[PDB]
Amino acid sequence: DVYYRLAKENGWRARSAFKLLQLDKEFQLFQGVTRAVDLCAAPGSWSQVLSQKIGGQGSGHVVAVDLQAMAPLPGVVQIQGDITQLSTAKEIIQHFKGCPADLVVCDGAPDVTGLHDVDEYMQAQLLLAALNIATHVLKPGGCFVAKIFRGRDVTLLYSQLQVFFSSVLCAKPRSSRNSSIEAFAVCQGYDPPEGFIPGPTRIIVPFVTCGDLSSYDSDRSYPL
Amino acid sequence: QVAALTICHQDLETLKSFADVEGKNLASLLLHCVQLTDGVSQIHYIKQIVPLLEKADKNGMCDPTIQSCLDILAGIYLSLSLKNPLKKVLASSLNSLPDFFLPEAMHRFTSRLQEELNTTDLYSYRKVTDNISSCMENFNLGRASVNNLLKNVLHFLQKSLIEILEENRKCAGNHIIQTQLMNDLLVGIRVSMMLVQKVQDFQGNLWKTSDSPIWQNMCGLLSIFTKVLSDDDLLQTVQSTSGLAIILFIKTMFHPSEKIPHLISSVLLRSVDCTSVPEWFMSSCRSLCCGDISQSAVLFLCQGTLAMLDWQNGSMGRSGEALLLDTAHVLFTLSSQIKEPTLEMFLSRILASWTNSAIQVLESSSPSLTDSLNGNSSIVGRLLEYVYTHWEHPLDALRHQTKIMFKNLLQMHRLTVEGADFVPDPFFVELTESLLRLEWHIKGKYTCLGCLVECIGVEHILAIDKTIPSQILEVMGDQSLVPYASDLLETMFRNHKSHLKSQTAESSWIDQWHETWVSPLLFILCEGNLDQKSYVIDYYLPKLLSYSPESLQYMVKILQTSIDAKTGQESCNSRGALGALMACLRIARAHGHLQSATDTWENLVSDARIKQGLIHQHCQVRIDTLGLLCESNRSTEIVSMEEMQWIQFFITYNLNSQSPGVRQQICSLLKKLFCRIQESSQVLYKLEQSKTKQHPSVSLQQYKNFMSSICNSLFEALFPGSSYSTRFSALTILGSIAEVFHVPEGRIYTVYQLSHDIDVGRFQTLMECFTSTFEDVKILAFDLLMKLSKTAVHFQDSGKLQGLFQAALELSTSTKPYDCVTASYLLNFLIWQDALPSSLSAYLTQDRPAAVVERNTLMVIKCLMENLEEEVSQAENSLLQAAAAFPMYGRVHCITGALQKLSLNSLQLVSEWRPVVEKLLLMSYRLSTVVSPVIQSSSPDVTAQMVLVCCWRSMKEVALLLGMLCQLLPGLLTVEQVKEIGDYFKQHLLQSRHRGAFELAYTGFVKLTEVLNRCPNVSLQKLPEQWLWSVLEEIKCSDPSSKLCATRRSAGIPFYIQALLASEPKKGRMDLLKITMKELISLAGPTDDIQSTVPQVHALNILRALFRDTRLGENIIPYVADGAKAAILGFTSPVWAVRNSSTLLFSALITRIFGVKRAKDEHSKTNRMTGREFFSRFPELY
RNA sequence: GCCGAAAUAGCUCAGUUGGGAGAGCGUUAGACUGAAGAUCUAAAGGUCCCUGGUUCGAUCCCGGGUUUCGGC
Ligand SMILES: Nc1ncnc2c1ncn2[C@@H]1O[C@H](CSCC[C@H](N)C(=O)O)[C@@H](O)[C@H]1O
Ligand SMILES: [Mg+2]
Ligand SMILES: [Mg+2]
Ligand SMILES: [Mg+2]
Ligand SMILES: [Mg+2]
Ligand SMILES: [Mg+2]
Ligand SMILES: [Mg+2]
Ligand SMILES: [Mg+2]
Ligand SMILES: [Zn+2]
């Protein structure tokens, strides 16, 4: 490919940066974003893109979190920890009392093994954690970008994501390897349920945590 | 190469006391022979030895001179190793001695052999055994001698075996010595079996009395054989051979012969009555009676039973048949219990041997055995179950043995149902129908169907379904199924042709044959997809054309028509016809079939058609047309002018091919053409000097012009900015020319010499090919420049070479990360052609060209080392400018590259090479210390990225340099230095905490570890096991506060364990693996202790790597099930890390068990296996 | 007419000694990230020109033959 070179040639810590930029020019992610959250940034390339495209104004605030350590950037605050753990979730949400983030990105992935079912399982777990963080932070009508692994069965993930967002789109930028099954779910228009706090919730939350339909079940014949 | 004959010094006077200055006697011939060096005229004089003895058949009493001559001949023969052909030479010569001289030669050679047998040196035993072996094969001199010394040779064999066993049990710890001792045991056992089989003394009883020394030596040998069979620390070859020997001796030594099959039967069933065997058997074979023998013992005993008994002619009778059935029962019982891979391979071989023995018995057996051995019997059912379970075993030997078993099963059934009326047997039909239900990706289907086709004939399979040939052709687009499909189709049409030439005896049958086998082939050739076309052309079409060459005329006529109709229309079938025609014609020409006609035909190919093919859009058509022109059956056929013009036309355009396979095929075919030119130029020259055709001198001039123009084209293709494929192709073809026409330099005539066509400028361009960014091009240019003659300073003046040296020195210190590769190639070129400046002689203190290249390497390495020392000191001062101005990894890379070219095992200036190696190690450690803290931690007009590049590149270069230096066979490398190197690799690779120094150190450590295994010093070859133990007991008490990191799939510990396990000899013993897997599986098991999570984590991280390594491969199977359990039981653990590790390990296990994916998307059934296979391979998972 | 050489995977080449046939290239599969993915892994593909022997067992030992050559 060519973007592995361009990552080293330019001031990008990894090739993955070019995946974010190519998702702007096709979805206009950085319309009016002022504060954004970056999940699972290994070297910080996505954090770098966000800082250069939002923090260039000066007031842009960016929070990056990963399982590993990162080289610090001007205008980005780094957190090391497992976003699956509740403590990391709490300290992340600690940064967003009052003003909520306009954009939440998640680039995480497990150690991709090659057979795709286990990758979907692990990615589903990571996406559930990321979605929890999002719903707990970003402002309604906001944006949530998340890496997914498009395998044979992707309807469930789309169904779950559609509940929380007005628009859900699946995109594969030019920088993504054509042999790889990775893709990106871009979620436009955060539209949380009316009775949802971080009626409708009793049906949605069980279905989003897992494909749990044990809310339409009944002990008497259904009304007509 | 031959070994010069030698003689005993004190024999000289003995042969001098009978020599004569005149030289009439044989003694003078011996003098002349021994005082020589060429082992060729000696052979001639050896022939003439016989007439000298023949010319004295009148004395009536052997001349003492002849006596001493033959004694010296015997002494020389017994002192000759088996690797020397002269040994067999004089064996053959003395085989033809005159009948008058036989008795004295008998007696005296007997005496020489006898005194040879009295040796007592342990390490001289192998030579004596080899001598006894030689005296048996087609050597009448030694056969009578050994026949006269049975007692002595048996005593020697017994004592030698005992002493070798004692020495082997005493030399535990060193495995090279143990390997040699095992080989000595093996040759001893094989020689003993030869003696018992091939001595005309063991027939009749004549020696079975207890007082006979032969009998007592035989009993002692039998006892040794039993003892070595029951042993388990020896090579399995030794034990199997021992089982063979045991059965052979029992068969030989047992007086009531008719009771031998019964007795052996009991021994196999472990149901022998200790109170009914003869006393000698109980004394010698106590282990065989009274139970408690391993499963390997029974396996090898039944192997010997099948191999070493007379199954033909029904000698053993009903007891023999019962023994056959009992052996089958025992083998099936063992099949379910054996789990070691090598033992499984042995069992497969033995089952195939059982089928052979069943064939032999069944050819004259009783009607009772027929019922128990037919295709519907239980035994054959179990055998078919074995075959179905095992045709897709990972081991190749297993699969081959299963094929043998299946073929023999069908033959057994045929023998049992010889009372047959109509050909298609119900059993065969049912088997065929059941096989046809399998999918077409099942590889065993093809082989089983081939055997069935040869059993019942292909007409019945075609009657069942007449679209089978098309179905088989449709899978031919998938490589790795192409060979099986090709073989099946070939079997099918061979059988079909044999069937059609049957009762219906005319010439029209071929038509039907054609429409069955050629028409679908033509359709595929014209309209198939690209992969299908390529594979059918490469694999299947040659078989069909070779079998029936008269079909070519049929194909061409069909294709030519489809070509001409194309011009009528100005269709796909008319579009692919040209490529198919070229493929058929290329195959026909290369095999010399009817198309061998002096520019490829009079009318099959025209100029327009050939030019169209040579430039076609499809790579396959271009390759097939080029092959039609280039390759011919006759290796010296003249290249015509038309072919030269077409080849020049082709070269103009086909140098930029993008497929590496296509490019490689093009280069190979062109090399074939150049070989044809070279070989026919010699014929032309011979005709020219021998004072229709065109006066061969004309053809020689044409060859010279053609080669010169081809070189012109190739050198034009090296213009600035030329692609990678065009430089690759040009340099490959130039190197091929240089190699092919470098043949007749010991000869007198050469049609072309590339060196004559090399100007100064062409040399400049060839050297400038060292600056290409691709290393393949650098390598090809280097090879081509080295192949040329008179090149070093002929093309270059001293000042410009000094400029080149300065340029290489400057490239070795540039910040660009890949200039050091160019500097290394430039420096190697200057070294290997003695083009270094004169000032470099000031670094060392003072034709064998190896010596001068070694001196040059030493000088340049010392210069690089001085620069490196200065730069490393300044880097210690401040790493910023070191990363900015003089990164240190370029010099290290150049040093390693220079050393890589030498033969480190055969240096000659060790006084000079010792201090340099010491300084090299010291500077490596200094540089590593400087740059490592930057690579574990974060950053400390120079960006941080280039600092990181400098640091990790230095890490990589130092690791590779240490791995290189480890190949000095520690001498120039002391044991302390090797220990320090190993410690360096252990400090990294376990404390890196970062991706750097995980795969960086692994390659160097693997090199060091393999060397450590092969080392003969005992203190060194025990290092890997000690390191393995150290790291394992480090793992148990991990204490999460340690420097070990969990991320990046582990703290490099899997790489350490993999490298240590790599030392184990390939398929040799694998004892480290058993220990490691026992400990890791135990660690990964459920733990009550909460703190015991981390030892459970690392295990699953290590195990994962161990289950995907290719080296461990088939040795890891007996642990899969256990590992699987762990993974599954680790998926339910409350801790997250244990579950994640379990997931990754389980992925690796799935890949190991079911194999790599066969196609990109569908995975219909390509990676599934039946329940029977899965639960036979891993029965503890059900 | 004698004498001698060569034949191993799709291609280019290794193979002391009788005990599972070795590599390179090409092909297939996998990879979220760095350190030219121009990289890493792990698979797949042969019974050694053909045919008889010797042997428990042959690429290897022995005898015939085929094809392509070299020498007299
Ligand atoms: N459970 C988890 N919690 C936090 N980070 C995680 C995680 N599982 C995986 N990750 C992170 O997922 C990332 C995989 S690749 C990340 C690429 C990075 N975003 C870039 O800009 O290039 C790694 O950073 C890994 O640490
Ligand atoms: Mg590194
Ligand atoms: Mg060879
Ligand atoms: Mg390869
Ligand atoms: Mg294989
Ligand atoms: Mg035999
Ligand atoms: Mg044979
Ligand atoms: Mg001739
Ligand atoms: Zn007993």
Gap between the Cα atoms of B303 and B246, Å rounded: 11
Between B1072-1084 and B1117-1129, two packed helices, what is the crossing angle to 10 degrees?
10
Chain breaks in chain B following residues, C–N > 2.5 Å: 570, 691, 846, 940, 970
Q: Which residues contact B743 (CB under 8 A, 6 or more apart)?
A: B678, B750
Report how far apart, in Å, the C-alpha atoms of B492 and of each of B425, B430, B453, B459, B472 are.
19, 19, 7, 9, 11
At which residue do the structure tokens 């098991």 appear?
B1085
Between B140-147 and B150-170, two packed helices, what is the crossing angle to 10 degrees?
90
Q: Which of A8, A114, A118 sits opposite B1143 (nearest CB)?
A: A118
Cα end-to-end span (Å), chain B: 60
Q: Which two tokens stand for residue A6?
A: 């361009």
Contact B1076, B1061 (CB under 8 A): yes
In A, which residues are within 8 Å of B818 by CB distance? none
What is the number of other CB atoms lying within 10 angstroms of the CB of residue A218? 8
What is the number of other CB atoms lying within 10 angstroms of the CB of residue B946? 15
Contact B436, B467 (CB under 8 A): no
Gap between the Cα atoms of B520 and B216, Å rounded: 72
Handedness of CA B449, B455, B456, B462 (dihedral sign): positive
Gap between the Cα atoms of A194 and B57, Å rounded: 126
Gap between the Cα atoms of B309 and B312, Å rounded: 9
Gap between the Cα atoms of B661 and B1164, Å rounded: 29
Q: Which two tokens stand for residue B310?
A: 């007379």
Residues 711-750 of B with CB under 7 A from strand C: none
Q: Is B1144 at the interface with chain A, CB within 8 A?
A: yes
What is the H or E stretch that residue B178 is in?
Answer: helix B175-197
Gap between the Cα atoms of A37 and B76, Å rounded: 90
Residue A102 is assigned to a ligand binding site: no
Residue B957: Cβ-neighbour burial (10 angstroms; 0-12, 13-18, 19+): buried
At which residue do the structure tokens 């376990």 appear?
B990
In B, which residues are within 8 Å of A8 by CB distance? 945
Gap between the Cα atoms of B804 and B798, Å rounded: 10
Handedness of CA B413, B417, B418, B423 (dihedral sign): negative
Q: Which of B938, B1047, B1147 sits opposite A67 (nearest CB)?
A: B1047
B592 CA from centroid of ligand 8 (Å):
19
Residue A1 is assigned to a ligand binding site: no
Report how far apart, in Å, the C-alpha atoms of B781 and of each of B284, B574, B691, B787, B1080 are.
70, 44, 43, 10, 50
Between B577-590 and B551-569, two packed helices, what is the crossing angle to 10 degrees?
150
Q: What is the number of the ligand 1 atom nearest to the C-alpha of A38?
A: 19
Q: Is the CB of B811 under 7 A from strand C?
A: no
- Phi and psi at residue A36, in whole multiples of 5°? -135, 155
Gap between the Cα atoms of A208 and A156, Å rounded: 9
Between B317-337 and B260-269, two packed helices, what is the crossing angle to 10 degrees?
20
Task: Compute the residue count for chain A.
Answer: 224
| Identity of the residue numbered B982 | G
Contact B422, B388 (CB under 8 A): no
Contact A111, B1144 (CB under 8 A): yes
Q: Which nucleotide is nearest to B241 (CA to C1')?
A: C56
Which one-letter DSSP state was computed for residue A171?
E
Gap between the Cα atoms of B964 and B970, Å rounded: 13
Buried b (16+ CB within 10 A) or exposed e, B275-289: eebeebbbebbebbb
Gap between the Cα atoms of A107 and A128, Å rounded: 13
B86 CA from centroid of ligand 3 (Å):
23
What is the H or E stretch that residue B239 is in?
Answer: helix B236-253
Residues 1067-1086 of B with CB under 7 A from strand C: 1067
Q: What is the number of the ligand 1 atom nearest to the C-alpha of A14?
A: 22
Helices (H), B35-99: 41-54, 64-78, 85-94
Q: Which residues contact B173 (CB under 8 A, 6 or more apart)?
A: B1018, B1022
Question: Which protein residues touch ligand 1 with a CB less than 6 Å away?
Answer: A 14, 16, 40-43, 45-46, 66-68, 82-84, 107-109, 126
Residues with CB under 5 A from ligand 9 (ion): B 274, 290
Q: Which nucleotide is nearest to B1113 (CA to C1')?
A: C42
What strands lie across the sheet with A61-66, from one edge to the other?
Answer: A76-80, A61-66, A35-39, A103-106, A143-149, A182-190, A165-171
Gap between the Cα atoms of B448 and B451, Å rounded: 5
Q: What is the four-CA torsion angle of B418, B419, B422, B424, rounded to 10 degrees?
A: -40
Q: Which of A68, A114, A122 sits opposite B1047 (nearest CB)?
A: A68
Pairing label, strands A182-190, A76-80: unpaired
Gap between the Cα atoms of B1153 and B1162, Å rounded: 19
Strand C positions within 7 A of protein Cβ atoms? 10-12, 16-17, 19-21, 25-38, 40-47, 55-57, 67-71
Which one-letter DSSP state was computed for residue A100?
P
Q: Which nucleotide is nearest to B817 (CA to C1')?
A: C36
Gap between the Cα atoms of B78 and B1023, Å rounded: 42
B534 CA from centroid of ligand 3 (Å):
29
Q: Which two tokens stand for residue B762?
A: 């062409």
What is the number of other CB atoms lying within 10 angstroms of the CB of residue B772? 18
Report how far apart, in Å, the C-alpha atoms of B948 and of each of B253, B838, B945, B991, B1047 are.
78, 38, 5, 18, 20
Residue A38 is assigned to a ligand binding site: no
Q: Which two tokens stand for residue B1089?
A: 């202790």
Distance from CA of A124 to the nearest CA of B (A): 14
Residue nearest to nucleotide C54 (CA to C1'): B137
| Identity of the residue numbered A40 | C
Gap between the Cα atoms of A191 and A193, Å rounded: 7
Task: Compute the residue count for chain B.
Answer: 1182
Q: Is the CB of B341 under 7 A from strand C?
A: yes
Residue A44 is assigned to a ligand binding site: yes
CA angle B951, B955, B956 (to 5 degrees): 120
Q: Is the CB of B1114 under 7 A from strand C?
A: yes
Report how far apart, in Å, the C-alpha atoms of A72 and of each of A11, A65, B880, B994 are.
14, 12, 20, 17
CA-closest candidate to residue B610, choices B567, B569, B647: B647
Q: Which two tokens stand for residue B719?
A: 């213009």
Question: In B826-938, which ranges are E strands?
Answer: none
Residue nearest to nucleotide C32 (CA to C1'): A109
User: In chain B, which among 1029-1068 make CB contacts under 8 A with chain A?
Assistant: 1047, 1049
CA-closest candidate to residue B522, choices B562, B475, B478, B465: B562
Gap between the Cα atoms of B586 and B545, Å rounded: 11
HEC per residue, B754-792: HHHHCCHHHHHHHHHHHHCCCHHHHHHHHHHHHHCCCCC
Residue A24 is assigned to a ligand binding site: no
Gap between the Cα atoms of B333 and B311, Å rounded: 23
Q: Which nucleotide is nearest to B1002 (CA to C1')?
A: C40
Handedness of CA B650, B653, B656, B658 (dihedral sign): negative
Q: Is the CB of B589 under 7 A from strand C?
A: no
Pairing label, strands A182-190, A165-171: antiparallel
- Please provide the DSSP assignment of B1016-1081 as one string: --HHHHTHHHHHHHHHHHHHHT--TTSS---STTSSSHHHHHHHHHHTSPTTT---HHHHHHHHHH
Contact B898, B904 (CB under 8 A): no
Q: Which two tokens stand for residue B158?
A: 């017994």
Gap between the Cα atoms of B498 and B495, Å rounded: 5
What is the H or E stretch that residue A185 is in?
Answer: strand A182-190
Q: What is the number of the ligand 1 atom nearest to the C-alpha of B1047?
A: 26
- Phi and psi at residue A145, in whole multiples of 5°? -110, 130
Q: Which residues contact B751 (CB under 8 A, 6 or more apart)?
A: B677, B678, B681, B685, B700, B703, B704, B707, B741
What is the number of other CB atoms lying within 10 angstroms of the CB of residue B1086? 12
3-state secondary structure of B88: helix
Residue nearest to nucleotide C38 (CA to C1'): B774
How determined? cryo-EM
Q: Is the CB of A61 under 7 A from strand C?
A: no
- Could B1136 and A84 be called an inter-chain contact, meaning their C-beta atoms sit closer than 8 Å? yes
Buried b (16+ CB within 10 A) or exposed e, B791-814: beeebbeeeebbebbeebbebbbb
A75 CA from centroid of ligand 6 (Å):
86
HEC per residue, B605-636: CCHHHHHHHHCCCCHHHHHHHHHHHHCCCCCC
CA-closest candidate to residue B319, choices B369, B278, B281: B369
Q: Is B1146 at the interface with chain A, CB within 8 A?
A: yes
Between B295-307 and B341-362, two packed helices, what is the crossing angle to 10 degrees?
30
Experimental resolution (Å): 2.7
Residue B392 CA distance to nucleotide C42 C1' (Å): 18
| Identity of the residue numbered B195 | L
Pairing label, strands A103-106, A143-149: parallel
Between B396-416 and B378-390, two packed helices, what is the crossing angle to 10 degrees?
150
Q: Is A156 at the interface with chain B, CB within 8 A?
A: no
Gap between the Cα atoms of B217 and B153, Å rounded: 10
3-state secondary structure of B522: helix
Report how far apart, in Å, the C-alpha atoms of B455 and of each of A198, B427, B428, B513, B1163 are.
75, 12, 8, 20, 34
Q: Which of A71, A121, A122 sits opposite B939 (nearest CB)?
A: A71
CA angle B956, B957, B960 (to 5 degrees): 85
Contact B1086, B1126 (CB under 8 A): no
At which residue do the structure tokens 């069942």 appear?
B464
